[PDB]
RNA sequence: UACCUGGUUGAUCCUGCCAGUAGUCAUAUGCUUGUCUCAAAGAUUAAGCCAUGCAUGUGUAAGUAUGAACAAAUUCAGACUGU
């Protein structure tokens, strides 16, 4: 079936790490998507947003390869991107939805005014750089919608944002950039230091040292 | 009610514009047009030229009646006292 490689991935398969956030509050990498599966599998949902082809020059032709970009995610704060190239459009797929799975990120979301329910919209001000493609992210009032672009737009729907404003510029039409603008955008959503976070860090024991005894065998 | 997409390359990222998408109590034109309620309408070029018809007349007890205007009265007198 599966045989991990990795202690983070032994640890997920023995059941001592139960949640996505035991991971990201240590940051450790994650280098095997059967974690992903386990963990958020069944709340997540890919989808392909775009086959691009390349084609590199040789001396009896050009040499076709496609470029396939997915995007997965729950909905309720979790999203990732993934981009493969690949001779095969199938394989692409399958590369890209392993890469997205990979690169799940946790989003943040806050309140624009009044803090009452569930949050709807980013904390605060962000912006995405990709090549020379720039997303801004701006909260937006509940019942505003999501005003982007349909990439963007696709993005948000799947990081769970329910309502925010978006402006973009450069060259937009590059799909990649886009996209991952997008994200990168997303991503810098909990690295905002606000007035909450002034607590002082209380520190837990990282996975590898509370279950060293486990994992020493 | 804070949004983009196609187009320079063998392929890439850009600048940059062209094209597309939507709006006008915005004009005109093409085709089509069964019902109800609203409703602009010779401004844009020529404040260019105009046949014909109409669009400014007016009376209260209280300015002026002798129509040779009508009507009712007067057998005798009457300036006039209804229109
Ligand atoms: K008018
Ligand atoms: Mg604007
Ligand atoms: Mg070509």
Same mark, same amino acid.
């Given at each position: 079936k599966?045989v991990?490689?990795?202690?983070?991935?032994?640890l997920?398969?023995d059941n001592?790490?139960?949640?996505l956030?035991?991971?990201?509050?240590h940051?450790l !990498?994650?280098?095997?998507?059967?974690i992903?599966?386990?963990?958020?599998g069944?709340?997540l949902?890919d989808?392909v947003?775009?086959?691009m082809?390349?084609?590199?020059q040789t001396?009896?032709?050009?040499?076709?390869?496609?470029?396939?970009?997915?995007?997965?995610?729950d909905?309720?704060?979790?999203? +990732?991107?993934?981009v493969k190239?690949?001779?095969?459009?199938?394989?692409?797929?399958?590369?890209?939805i392993?890469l997205?799975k990979?690169?799940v990120?946790?989003?943040?979301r806050?309140?624009w005014?009044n803090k009452?329910?569930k949050?709807?919209?980013?904390?605060?001000?962000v912006?995405?750089?990709?090549?020379?493609?720039?997303?801004?992210?701006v909260?937006?009032?509940?019942?505003?919608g999501?005003?982007?672009?349909?990439? !963007?737009?696709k993005?948000?729907?799947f990081?769970?944002?329910?309502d925010?404003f978006?402006?973009?510029? +450069?060259?937009?039409?590059?799909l990649?950039?886009?996209?991952?603008?997008?994200?990168?955008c997303?991503?810098?959503?909990?690295?905002?230091?606000?007035?909450?976070?002034?607590?002082?860090?209380?520190?837990?024991?990282?996975?590898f040292?509370?279950?060293?005894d486990?994992?020493?065998k």
């Amino acid at each position: 079936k599966w045989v991990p490689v990795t202690k983070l991935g032994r640890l997920v398969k023995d059941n001592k790490i139960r949640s996505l956030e035991q991971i990201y509050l240590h940051s450790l !990498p994650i280098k095997e998507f059967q974690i992903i599966d386990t963990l958020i599998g069944p709340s997540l949902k890919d989808e392909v947003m775009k086959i691009m082809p390349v084609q590199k020059q040789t001396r009896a032709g050009q040499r076709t390869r496609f470029k396939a970009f997915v995007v997965v995610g729950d909905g309720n704060g979790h999203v +990732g991107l993934g981009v493969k190239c690949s001779k095969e459009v199938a394989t692409a797929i399958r590369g890209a939805i392993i890469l997205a799975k990979l690169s799940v990120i946790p989003v943040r979301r806050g309140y624009w005014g009044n803090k009452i329910g569930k949050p709807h919209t980013v904390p605060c001000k962000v912006t995405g750089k990709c090549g020379s493609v720039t997303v801004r992210m701006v909260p937006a009032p509940r019942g505003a919608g999501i005003v982007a672009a349909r990439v !963007p737009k696709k993005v948000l729907q799947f990081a769970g944002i329910e309502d925010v404003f978006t402006s973009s510029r +450069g060259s937009t039409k590059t799909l990649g950039n886009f996209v991952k603008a997008t994200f990168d955008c997303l991503m810098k959503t909990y690295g905002f230091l606000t007035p909450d976070f002034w607590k002082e860090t209380r520190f837990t024991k990282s996975p590898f040292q509370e279950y060293a005894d486990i994992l020493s065998k």
